[PDB]
Design a protein around this ligand. Sequence first.
Ligand SMILES: O=c1ccn([C@H]2C[C@H](O)[C@@H](CO)O2)c(=O)[nH]1
Ligand SMILES: O=c1ccn([C@H]2C[C@H](O)[C@@H](CO)O2)c(=O)[nH]1
Ligand SMILES: O=c1ccn([C@H]2C[C@H](O)[C@@H](CO)O2)c(=O)[nH]1
Ligand SMILES: [Cl-]
Ligand SMILES: [Cl-]
Ligand SMILES: [Mg+2]
Ligand SMILES: [Mg+2]
Lengths: 143, 130, 143
Amino acid sequence: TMQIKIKYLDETQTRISKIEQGDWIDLRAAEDVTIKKDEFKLVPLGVAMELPEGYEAHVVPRSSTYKNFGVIQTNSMGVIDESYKGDNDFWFFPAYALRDTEIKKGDRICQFRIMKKMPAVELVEVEHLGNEDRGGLGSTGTK
Amino acid sequence: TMQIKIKYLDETQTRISKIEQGDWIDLRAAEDVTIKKDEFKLVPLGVAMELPEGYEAHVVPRSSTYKNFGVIQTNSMGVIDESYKGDNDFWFFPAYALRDTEIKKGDRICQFRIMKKMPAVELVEVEHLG
Amino acid sequence: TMQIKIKYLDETQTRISKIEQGDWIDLRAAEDVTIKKDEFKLVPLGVAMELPEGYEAHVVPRSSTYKNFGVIQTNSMGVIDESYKGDNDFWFFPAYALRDTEIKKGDRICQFRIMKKMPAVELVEVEHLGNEDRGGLGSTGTK
Ligand SMILES: O=c1ccn([C@H]2C[C@H](O)[C@@H](CO)O2)c(=O)[nH]1
Ligand SMILES: O=c1ccn([C@H]2C[C@H](O)[C@@H](CO)O2)c(=O)[nH]1
Ligand SMILES: O=c1ccn([C@H]2C[C@H](O)[C@@H](CO)O2)c(=O)[nH]1
Ligand SMILES: [Cl-]
Ligand SMILES: [Cl-]
Ligand SMILES: [Mg+2]
Ligand SMILES: [Mg+2]
Protein backbone atom coordinates (compact mmCIF):
# COMPACT_ATOMS: atom_id res chain seq x y z
CA THR A 1 0.00 0.00 0.00
CA MET A 2 2.69 2.48 1.08
CA GLN A 3 5.92 2.05 -0.80
CA ILE A 4 9.48 1.80 0.57
CA LYS A 5 12.04 2.30 -2.17
CA ILE A 6 15.15 0.27 -1.61
CA LYS A 7 18.54 0.57 -3.19
CA TYR A 8 21.09 -2.22 -2.66
CA LEU A 9 24.79 -1.67 -2.35
CA ASP A 10 25.35 -4.00 -5.31
CA GLU A 11 23.94 -6.98 -7.13
CA THR A 12 25.49 -9.44 -4.70
CA GLN A 13 23.40 -8.31 -1.70
CA THR A 14 20.69 -10.75 -0.71
CA ARG A 15 17.36 -9.05 -1.29
CA ILE A 16 15.26 -8.60 1.87
CA SER A 17 11.77 -10.00 2.20
CA LYS A 18 8.66 -9.97 4.44
CA ILE A 19 7.68 -13.30 5.94
CA GLU A 20 4.15 -14.06 7.02
CA GLN A 21 5.01 -14.71 10.69
CA GLY A 22 7.42 -11.76 11.00
CA ASP A 23 5.86 -8.45 11.90
CA TRP A 24 9.28 -6.72 11.33
CA ILE A 25 11.50 -7.33 8.29
CA ASP A 26 14.92 -8.93 8.64
CA LEU A 27 18.03 -7.14 7.50
CA ARG A 28 21.24 -8.79 6.36
CA ALA A 29 24.97 -8.44 6.68
CA ALA A 30 26.47 -6.91 3.52
CA GLU A 31 29.79 -8.73 3.88
CA ASP A 32 31.46 -11.31 6.08
CA VAL A 33 32.54 -9.73 9.41
CA THR A 34 34.86 -11.05 12.11
CA ILE A 35 34.63 -9.37 15.50
CA LYS A 36 36.87 -10.19 18.50
CA LYS A 37 35.47 -10.44 21.98
CA ASP A 38 34.94 -7.08 23.55
CA GLU A 39 35.41 -5.19 20.33
CA PHE A 40 33.08 -3.13 18.17
CA LYS A 41 32.15 -3.06 14.49
CA LEU A 42 29.69 -1.08 12.38
CA VAL A 43 28.23 -3.96 10.29
CA PRO A 44 27.03 -2.77 6.89
CA LEU A 45 23.46 -3.84 5.99
CA GLY A 46 23.87 -2.99 2.29
CA VAL A 47 20.54 -1.14 1.94
CA ALA A 48 19.55 2.51 1.47
CA MET A 49 15.85 3.41 1.57
CA GLU A 50 13.39 6.21 0.86
CA LEU A 51 10.73 5.82 3.52
CA PRO A 52 7.27 7.30 3.18
CA GLU A 53 7.03 11.02 4.06
CA GLY A 54 6.39 11.53 7.75
CA TYR A 55 7.81 8.11 8.74
CA GLU A 56 10.92 6.76 10.43
CA ALA A 57 12.43 3.30 10.69
CA HIS A 58 13.52 1.51 13.84
CA VAL A 59 16.17 -1.21 13.80
CA VAL A 60 16.70 -3.75 16.65
CA PRO A 61 18.38 -7.13 16.97
CA ARG A 62 16.53 -10.40 16.61
CA SER A 63 15.91 -12.39 19.76
CA SER A 64 18.38 -14.93 18.45
CA THR A 65 21.10 -12.40 17.47
CA TYR A 66 23.08 -13.01 20.60
CA LYS A 67 22.82 -16.79 20.53
CA ASN A 68 23.71 -16.92 16.82
CA PHE A 69 26.24 -14.11 16.57
CA GLY A 70 27.40 -13.06 20.02
CA VAL A 71 26.66 -9.36 19.61
CA ILE A 72 24.50 -6.64 21.14
CA GLN A 73 23.46 -3.40 19.42
CA THR A 74 25.28 -0.54 21.14
CA ASN A 75 22.71 2.17 20.31
CA SER A 76 19.87 -0.13 21.55
CA MET A 77 17.51 0.76 18.74
CA GLY A 78 18.56 2.65 15.63
CA VAL A 79 16.41 5.42 14.28
CA ILE A 80 16.44 6.09 10.53
CA ASP A 81 14.67 9.39 9.77
CA GLU A 82 12.82 9.97 6.52
CA SER A 83 15.54 12.44 5.56
CA TYR A 84 18.21 9.70 5.44
CA LYS A 85 17.24 8.91 1.79
CA GLY A 86 20.23 9.75 -0.34
CA ASP A 87 21.77 7.46 -2.96
CA ASN A 88 24.69 6.76 -0.63
CA ASP A 89 22.76 6.66 2.71
CA PHE A 90 23.36 3.03 3.59
CA TRP A 91 22.27 1.48 6.88
CA PHE A 92 24.63 -0.03 9.49
CA PHE A 93 24.21 -2.16 12.56
CA PRO A 94 26.46 -1.10 15.49
CA ALA A 95 27.65 -4.37 17.01
CA TYR A 96 29.59 -5.01 20.24
CA ALA A 97 30.80 -8.58 20.50
CA LEU A 98 30.54 -10.34 23.82
CA ARG A 99 32.45 -13.32 22.32
CA ASP A 100 34.62 -13.86 19.30
CA THR A 101 32.23 -14.11 16.32
CA GLU A 102 31.90 -14.58 12.58
CA ILE A 103 28.96 -13.09 10.71
CA LYS A 104 28.50 -14.22 7.13
CA LYS A 105 27.39 -12.20 4.14
CA GLY A 106 23.63 -12.43 3.89
CA ASP A 107 22.99 -13.44 7.54
CA ARG A 108 19.82 -12.02 9.06
CA ILE A 109 21.15 -10.16 12.14
CA CYS A 110 18.54 -7.49 12.86
CA GLN A 111 15.01 -6.40 11.99
CA PHE A 112 13.20 -3.18 11.11
CA ARG A 113 9.83 -1.56 10.82
CA ILE A 114 8.48 1.87 9.95
CA MET A 115 6.11 4.03 11.89
CA LYS A 116 4.97 7.58 11.94
CA LYS A 117 7.25 10.23 13.40
CA MET A 118 6.12 11.90 16.58
CA PRO A 119 3.67 14.74 16.30
CA ALA A 120 5.01 18.37 16.17
CA VAL A 121 5.65 19.56 19.68
CA GLU A 122 6.59 22.74 21.40
CA LEU A 123 8.76 22.69 24.48
CA VAL A 124 7.66 25.44 26.87
CA GLU A 125 9.93 26.15 29.81
CA VAL A 126 8.24 26.47 33.20
CA GLU A 127 9.69 27.28 36.59
CA HIS A 128 7.47 24.82 38.49
CA LEU A 129 5.30 21.87 37.40
CA GLY A 130 2.99 21.67 40.47
CA ASN A 131 2.58 17.91 40.34
CA GLU A 132 3.24 15.19 42.92
CA ASP A 133 6.29 13.10 42.23
CA ARG A 134 5.79 9.57 40.82
CA GLY A 135 9.27 8.43 41.65
CA GLY A 136 11.13 6.06 39.36
CA LEU A 137 14.05 3.64 39.13
CA GLY A 138 12.36 0.81 40.82
CA SER A 139 9.99 2.75 43.09
CA THR A 140 7.34 0.08 42.69
CA GLY A 141 9.66 -2.71 43.98
CA THR A 142 9.96 -6.15 42.42
CA LYS A 143 7.55 -8.54 44.11
CA THR B 1 -11.86 -1.89 24.94
CA MET B 2 -9.45 -4.31 23.49
CA GLN B 3 -8.76 -7.65 25.10
CA ILE B 4 -5.52 -9.49 25.63
CA LYS B 5 -6.05 -13.18 26.24
CA ILE B 6 -3.40 -14.59 28.60
CA LYS B 7 -2.69 -18.23 29.30
CA TYR B 8 -0.36 -18.93 32.21
CA LEU B 9 2.18 -21.75 32.36
CA ASP B 10 0.64 -23.08 35.55
CA GLU B 11 -1.29 -22.13 38.65
CA THR B 12 1.91 -21.04 40.50
CA GLN B 13 2.58 -18.13 38.09
CA THR B 14 1.74 -14.75 39.63
CA ARG B 15 -1.02 -13.18 37.57
CA ILE B 16 0.07 -9.98 35.92
CA SER B 17 -1.63 -6.65 36.50
CA LYS B 18 -1.81 -3.05 35.28
CA ILE B 19 -0.84 -0.38 37.70
CA GLU B 20 -2.11 3.17 37.48
CA GLN B 21 1.28 4.81 37.07
CA GLY B 22 2.77 2.17 34.82
CA ASP B 23 2.11 2.80 31.17
CA TRP B 24 3.57 -0.61 30.29
CA ILE B 25 2.67 -3.81 32.14
CA ASP B 26 5.19 -5.69 34.26
CA LEU B 27 6.06 -9.30 33.45
CA ARG B 28 7.42 -11.83 35.88
CA ALA B 29 9.99 -14.61 36.11
CA ALA B 30 8.28 -18.01 35.87
CA GLU B 31 10.81 -19.73 38.12
CA ASP B 32 13.99 -19.01 40.06
CA VAL B 33 16.89 -18.37 37.67
CA THR B 34 20.62 -18.21 38.44
CA ILE B 35 22.86 -16.58 35.82
CA LYS B 36 26.62 -16.33 36.17
CA LYS B 37 28.73 -13.34 35.09
CA ASP B 38 29.12 -13.07 31.32
CA GLU B 39 26.54 -15.74 30.57
CA PHE B 40 23.23 -15.68 28.75
CA LYS B 41 19.93 -17.25 29.77
CA LEU B 42 16.40 -17.04 28.34
CA VAL B 43 14.34 -16.07 31.48
CA PRO B 44 10.89 -17.65 31.10
CA LEU B 45 7.97 -15.29 31.71
CA GLY B 46 5.25 -17.92 32.17
CA VAL B 47 2.75 -16.32 29.81
CA ALA B 48 1.39 -17.01 26.34
CA MET B 49 -1.00 -14.45 24.87
CA GLU B 50 -3.30 -13.73 21.97
CA LEU B 51 -3.13 -10.04 21.22
CA PRO B 52 -5.86 -8.05 19.49
CA GLU B 53 -6.10 -8.50 15.76
CA GLY B 54 -3.37 -6.57 13.99
CA TYR B 55 -1.19 -5.94 17.05
CA GLU B 56 2.33 -6.85 18.13
CA ALA B 57 3.87 -6.48 21.56
CA HIS B 58 7.13 -4.88 22.66
CA VAL B 59 9.14 -5.96 25.71
CA VAL B 60 11.88 -3.95 27.39
CA PRO B 61 13.59 -4.10 30.80
CA ARG B 62 12.43 -2.13 33.74
CA SER B 63 14.77 0.68 34.61
CA SER B 64 15.59 -1.10 37.88
CA THR B 65 16.33 -4.47 36.24
CA TYR B 66 20.03 -3.82 35.90
CA LYS B 67 20.53 -2.65 39.51
CA ASN B 68 18.37 -5.37 40.95
CA PHE B 69 19.36 -8.24 38.76
CA GLY B 70 22.51 -7.34 36.87
CA VAL B 71 21.20 -8.21 33.41
CA ILE B 72 20.69 -6.52 30.06
CA GLN B 73 18.20 -7.63 27.41
CA THR B 74 20.22 -8.80 24.42
CA ASN B 75 17.67 -7.90 21.80
CA SER B 76 17.15 -4.38 23.25
CA MET B 77 13.38 -4.32 22.70
CA GLY B 78 11.79 -7.67 22.09
CA VAL B 79 9.09 -7.94 19.47
CA ILE B 80 6.30 -10.44 20.05
CA ASP B 81 4.88 -11.17 16.66
CA GLU B 82 1.07 -11.38 16.43
CA SER B 83 1.41 -14.99 15.23
CA TYR B 84 3.17 -16.01 18.50
CA LYS B 85 -0.12 -16.98 20.05
CA GLY B 86 0.00 -20.81 20.24
CA ASP B 87 -0.48 -22.75 23.46
CA ASN B 88 3.26 -23.42 23.70
CA ASP B 89 4.35 -19.91 22.61
CA PHE B 90 5.46 -18.76 26.05
CA TRP B 91 7.25 -15.39 26.27
CA PHE B 92 10.83 -15.07 27.41
CA PHE B 93 13.27 -12.35 28.41
CA PRO B 94 16.70 -12.90 26.75
CA ALA B 95 19.15 -11.93 29.54
CA TYR B 96 22.86 -11.43 29.55
CA ALA B 97 24.36 -11.13 33.05
CA LEU B 98 27.09 -8.58 33.75
CA ARG B 99 27.55 -10.04 37.26
CA ASP B 100 26.50 -13.22 39.04
CA THR B 101 22.83 -12.95 39.78
CA GLU B 102 19.72 -14.64 41.11
CA ILE B 103 16.18 -13.87 39.95
CA LYS B 104 13.29 -15.24 42.01
CA LYS B 105 10.00 -16.68 40.78
CA GLY B 106 7.47 -13.89 40.48
CA ASP B 107 9.92 -11.03 40.29
CA ARG B 108 8.94 -8.20 37.95
CA ILE B 109 11.84 -7.98 35.55
CA CYS B 110 10.53 -6.45 32.32
CA GLN B 111 7.54 -4.62 30.93
CA PHE B 112 5.40 -4.81 27.80
CA ARG B 113 2.90 -2.95 25.69
CA ILE B 114 0.96 -3.60 22.53
CA MET B 115 1.29 -1.60 19.30
CA LYS B 116 -0.39 -1.83 15.87
CA LYS B 117 1.89 -3.71 13.49
CA MET B 118 3.37 -2.05 10.49
CA PRO B 119 0.80 -2.32 7.65
CA ALA B 120 1.52 -4.22 4.55
CA VAL B 121 4.15 -2.27 2.55
CA GLU B 122 5.62 -2.65 -0.96
CA LEU B 123 9.39 -2.95 -1.16
CA VAL B 124 10.26 -1.45 -4.55
CA GLU B 125 13.82 -1.97 -5.59
CA VAL B 126 15.35 1.00 -7.36
CA GLU B 127 18.71 1.62 -9.00
CA HIS B 128 19.12 5.07 -7.48
CA LEU B 129 17.48 7.13 -4.84
CA GLY B 130 16.10 10.47 -6.04
CA THR C 1 1.47 21.65 18.07
CA MET C 2 1.14 19.77 21.34
CA GLN C 3 2.87 21.33 24.23
CA ILE C 4 5.47 19.73 26.49
CA LYS C 5 6.12 21.66 29.75
CA ILE C 6 9.82 21.42 30.63
CA LYS C 7 11.47 22.36 33.90
CA TYR C 8 15.23 22.43 34.20
CA LEU C 9 17.08 21.32 37.33
CA ASP C 10 18.88 24.68 37.53
CA GLU C 11 19.92 27.65 35.54
CA THR C 12 23.14 25.98 34.41
CA GLN C 13 21.42 23.24 32.40
CA THR C 14 21.78 23.65 28.71
CA ARG C 15 18.26 24.48 27.25
CA ILE C 16 16.75 22.43 24.37
CA SER C 17 13.64 24.40 23.21
CA LYS C 18 14.09 24.98 19.42
CA ILE C 19 11.49 24.49 16.52
CA GLU C 20 10.50 20.77 16.67
CA GLN C 21 8.93 19.11 13.59
CA GLY C 22 8.98 15.34 14.40
CA ASP C 23 12.66 14.43 14.83
CA TRP C 24 13.87 12.82 18.04
CA ILE C 25 15.14 15.36 20.61
CA ASP C 26 18.59 15.24 22.16
CA LEU C 27 19.09 15.25 25.96
CA ARG C 28 22.21 16.23 27.85
CA ALA C 29 24.18 15.25 30.89
CA ALA C 30 23.29 17.54 33.85
CA GLU C 31 26.81 17.35 35.41
CA ASP C 32 30.21 15.85 34.68
CA VAL C 33 30.17 12.02 35.18
CA THR C 34 33.16 9.73 35.39
CA ILE C 35 32.53 5.98 34.92
CA LYS C 36 35.06 3.23 35.28
CA LYS C 37 35.24 0.23 32.94
CA ASP C 38 32.56 -2.31 33.78
CA GLU C 39 30.67 0.02 36.14
CA PHE C 40 27.33 1.63 36.10
CA LYS C 41 26.09 5.15 36.66
CA LEU C 42 23.00 7.05 36.37
CA VAL C 43 23.55 9.92 34.22
CA PRO C 44 21.21 12.75 35.31
CA LEU C 45 19.63 14.60 32.39
CA GLY C 46 18.53 17.69 34.35
CA VAL C 47 14.98 17.90 32.95
CA ALA C 48 11.53 17.18 34.30
CA MET C 49 8.55 17.31 31.91
CA GLU C 50 4.83 17.17 31.69
CA LEU C 51 4.00 15.36 28.47
CA PRO C 52 0.74 15.92 26.51
CA GLU C 53 -2.28 14.11 27.80
CA GLY C 54 -2.18 10.40 26.95
CA TYR C 55 1.50 10.28 25.94
CA GLU C 56 4.62 8.50 27.19
CA ALA C 57 8.20 9.15 26.14
CA HIS C 58 10.91 6.77 24.87
CA VAL C 59 14.64 7.33 25.38
CA VAL C 60 17.48 5.64 23.52
CA PRO C 61 21.15 6.42 23.03
CA ARG C 62 22.26 8.71 20.29
CA SER C 63 24.00 6.96 17.42
CA SER C 64 27.32 8.51 18.53
CA THR C 65 27.01 7.73 22.25
CA TYR C 66 29.04 4.51 22.25
CA LYS C 67 31.80 6.02 20.09
CA ASN C 68 31.94 9.19 22.17
CA PHE C 69 31.47 7.74 25.67
CA GLY C 70 31.86 3.98 25.64
CA VAL C 71 28.47 3.36 27.33
CA ILE C 72 25.40 1.33 26.61
CA GLN C 73 21.93 2.04 28.04
CA THR C 74 21.16 -0.75 30.49
CA ASN C 75 17.42 -0.65 30.02
CA SER C 76 17.83 -0.43 26.21
CA MET C 77 14.93 1.89 25.63
CA GLY C 78 13.70 3.86 28.60
CA VAL C 79 10.03 4.42 29.05
CA ILE C 80 9.02 7.66 30.74
CA ASP C 81 5.59 7.05 32.18
CA GLU C 82 3.09 9.90 31.75
CA SER C 83 2.75 10.17 35.54
CA TYR C 84 6.51 10.96 35.86
CA LYS C 85 5.74 14.70 35.85
CA GLY C 86 6.54 15.87 39.39
CA ASP C 87 8.80 18.73 40.27
CA ASN C 88 11.51 16.25 41.33
CA ASP C 89 10.85 13.61 38.63
CA PHE C 90 14.06 14.35 36.76
CA TRP C 91 14.93 12.09 33.81
CA PHE C 92 18.02 9.88 33.85
CA PHE C 93 20.02 7.78 31.40
CA PRO C 94 21.13 4.45 32.95
CA ALA C 95 24.68 3.90 31.64
CA TYR C 96 27.06 0.94 31.76
CA ALA C 97 30.60 1.68 30.69
CA LEU C 98 32.52 -0.79 28.58
CA ARG C 99 35.68 1.36 28.99
CA ASP C 100 36.84 4.09 31.36
CA THR C 101 35.02 7.24 30.34
CA GLU C 102 34.29 10.89 31.08
CA ILE C 103 30.99 12.59 30.22
CA LYS C 104 30.93 16.40 30.45
CA LYS C 105 28.15 18.57 31.69
CA GLY C 106 25.99 19.58 28.75
CA ASP C 107 27.09 16.77 26.49
CA ARG C 108 24.34 15.25 24.35
CA ILE C 109 24.01 11.60 25.27
CA CYS C 110 20.55 10.28 24.47
CA GLN C 111 17.44 11.18 22.52
CA PHE C 112 13.70 10.99 23.02
CA ARG C 113 10.36 11.07 21.35
CA ILE C 114 6.76 10.94 22.57
CA MET C 115 4.30 8.29 21.74
CA LYS C 116 0.64 7.69 22.51
CA LYS C 117 0.45 5.21 25.34
CA MET C 118 -1.26 1.85 25.00
CA PRO C 119 -5.01 2.41 25.67
CA ALA C 120 -6.81 0.74 28.42
CA VAL C 121 -6.92 -3.00 27.77
CA GLU C 122 -8.68 -5.89 29.44
CA LEU C 123 -6.48 -8.72 30.57
CA VAL C 124 -8.51 -11.88 30.21
CA GLU C 125 -7.14 -15.10 31.63
CA VAL C 126 -7.95 -18.06 29.50
CA GLU C 127 -7.31 -21.73 29.91
CA HIS C 128 -6.41 -22.49 26.33
CA LEU C 129 -5.54 -20.23 23.39
CA GLY C 130 -6.45 -22.67 20.61
CA ASN C 131 -3.97 -21.39 18.00
CA GLU C 132 -1.14 -23.14 16.21
CA ASP C 133 2.35 -22.53 17.64
CA ARG C 134 4.65 -20.15 15.84
CA GLY C 135 7.80 -21.02 17.71
CA GLY C 136 10.36 -18.30 18.42
CA LEU C 137 13.96 -17.54 19.46
CA GLY C 138 15.44 -18.01 16.05
CA SER C 139 12.97 -20.51 14.66
CA THR C 140 13.39 -18.98 11.20
CA GLY C 141 17.13 -19.50 11.14
CA THR C 142 19.75 -17.11 9.88
CA LYS C 143 20.17 -17.60 6.10
O1 LIG D 1 21.52 2.07 14.01
C1 LIG D 1 21.52 2.97 13.14
C2 LIG D 1 20.96 4.25 13.32
C3 LIG D 1 21.10 5.20 12.36
N1 LIG D 1 21.60 4.89 11.12
C4 LIG D 1 21.74 5.92 10.08
C5 LIG D 1 20.65 6.96 10.08
C6 LIG D 1 21.24 8.17 10.77
O2 LIG D 1 20.74 9.39 10.19
C7 LIG D 1 22.74 8.03 10.44
C8 LIG D 1 23.66 8.57 11.47
O3 LIG D 1 23.44 8.02 12.71
O4 LIG D 1 22.96 6.62 10.26
C9 LIG D 1 22.10 3.63 10.90
O5 LIG D 1 22.60 3.35 9.82
N2 LIG D 1 22.02 2.73 11.92
O1 LIG E 1 12.27 -10.81 23.72
C1 LIG E 1 11.57 -11.60 23.06
C2 LIG E 1 11.50 -11.64 21.65
C3 LIG E 1 10.78 -12.62 21.06
N1 LIG E 1 10.09 -13.56 21.75
C4 LIG E 1 9.26 -14.57 21.05
C5 LIG E 1 8.03 -13.95 20.35
C6 LIG E 1 8.44 -13.65 18.97
O2 LIG E 1 7.34 -13.69 18.06
C7 LIG E 1 9.37 -14.84 18.73
C8 LIG E 1 10.43 -14.60 17.68
O3 LIG E 1 11.14 -13.34 17.91
O4 LIG E 1 10.06 -15.09 19.95
C9 LIG E 1 10.03 -13.51 23.11
O5 LIG E 1 9.39 -14.27 23.81
N2 LIG E 1 10.85 -12.57 23.72
O1 LIG F 1 15.66 5.38 31.15
C1 LIG F 1 14.83 5.74 31.97
C2 LIG F 1 13.68 4.97 32.40
C3 LIG F 1 12.88 5.51 33.36
N1 LIG F 1 13.05 6.78 33.85
C4 LIG F 1 12.07 7.29 34.93
C5 LIG F 1 10.74 7.64 34.27
C6 LIG F 1 9.89 6.45 34.47
O2 LIG F 1 8.52 6.78 34.55
C7 LIG F 1 10.39 5.95 35.84
C8 LIG F 1 10.21 4.47 36.06
O3 LIG F 1 10.76 3.71 35.03
O4 LIG F 1 11.81 6.24 35.83
C9 LIG F 1 14.06 7.56 33.39
O5 LIG F 1 14.20 8.76 33.78
N2 LIG F 1 14.92 7.04 32.47
CL1 LIG G 1 7.39 0.85 21.76
CL1 LIG H 1 9.81 4.55 19.75
MG1 LIG I 1 12.14 -13.06 13.58
MG1 LIG J 1 7.80 0.43 36.24
